[PDB]
């Protein structure tokens, strides 16, 4: 695994999370676009909702794991699961 460069892993999750942020924020923007009134087709608004939900889960796991990284970073006695 990683020796003392545990800081690298943490930043990696920050990056991954941020990437997903663009994904989540992207879908939401599209949602607000079709949310107002009825333009083009409703199918577009639906796709934005589903893709957005998927991203929500993405951030949820990445976010929690990130917290796990900093947690295990402080403690040096407790072993990993």
């Amino acid at each position: 695994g990683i020796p003392a460069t545990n800081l690298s892993r943490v930043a990696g999750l920050e990056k991954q999370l941020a990437i997903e942020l663009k994904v989540k924020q992207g879908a939401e923007n599209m949602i607000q676009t079709y949310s107002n009134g009825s333009t083009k087709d409703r199918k577009l608004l639906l796709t934005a909702q589903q893709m957005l939900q998927d991203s929500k889960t993405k951030i949820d796991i990445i976010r929690m794991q990130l917290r796990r990284a900093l947690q295990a970073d402080q403690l040096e006695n407790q072993a990993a699961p």
Partner: protein, 192 residues
């Protein structure tokens, strides 16, 4: 206002956003920043009839598999972008893009684009291709490709010189008006 959904895609490394921006700004400012947004329409003149154009370019990101262009499915017509000076790009466009569209058989028209024309008609550059044993594509070569894949129309253009950018969009629009229509709707489930 005739609003048509056209999505620009290409197996190449880049050239997806530059193609659309060149026609809307007459000059690509550059920018290497990835693509996330979508809202981007432009007015086009076809036969003297104002037409609303929907510009949607997909970024070269795999993670955005889910956040893929929502327009793509509804896209009245998608443009096939490849490098003319490189036969390989032409070899793979029909190789991967064709088997996918046929799997659904939407009967949706398909236009062909020959981006990067500035280096396609460049003697010195062409000479460089020889170094790699590659040769640029000619007009009749692509024309034949349109017949096999049943493409509605095939043309070549440049974003730097603007050979026939307007022609691409102009013809792409007709792709839905004259040839068979589009309109494709299908839900996955009641709840998400």
């Amino acid at each position: 206002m005739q609003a048509i959904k056209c999505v620009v895609v290409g197996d190449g490394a880049v050239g997806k956003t530059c193609l659309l921006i060149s026609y809307t700004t007459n000059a690509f400012p550059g920018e290497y920043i990835p693509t996330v947004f979508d809202n981007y329409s432009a007015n086009v003149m076809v036969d003297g009839k104002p037409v609303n154009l929907g510009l949607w370019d997909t970024a070269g990101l795999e993670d955005y598999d889910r956040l893929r262009p929502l327009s793509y499915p509804q896209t009245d017509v998608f443009l096939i972008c490849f490098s003319l000076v490189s036969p390989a790009s032409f070899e793979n466009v029909r190789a991967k893009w064709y088997p996918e569209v046929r799997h659904h058989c939407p009967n949706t028209p398909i236009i062909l684009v020959g981006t990067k024309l500035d280096l396609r008609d460049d003697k010195d550059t062409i000479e460089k291709l020889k170094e790699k044993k590659l040769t640029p594509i000619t007009y009749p070569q692509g024309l034949a490709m349109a017949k096999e894949i049943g493409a509605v129309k095939y043309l070549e253009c440049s974003a730097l010189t603007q050979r026939g950018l307007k022609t691409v969009f102009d013809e792409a629009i007709r792709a839905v008006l004259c040839p068979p229509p589009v309109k494709k709707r299908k839900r996955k489930c009641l709840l998400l």
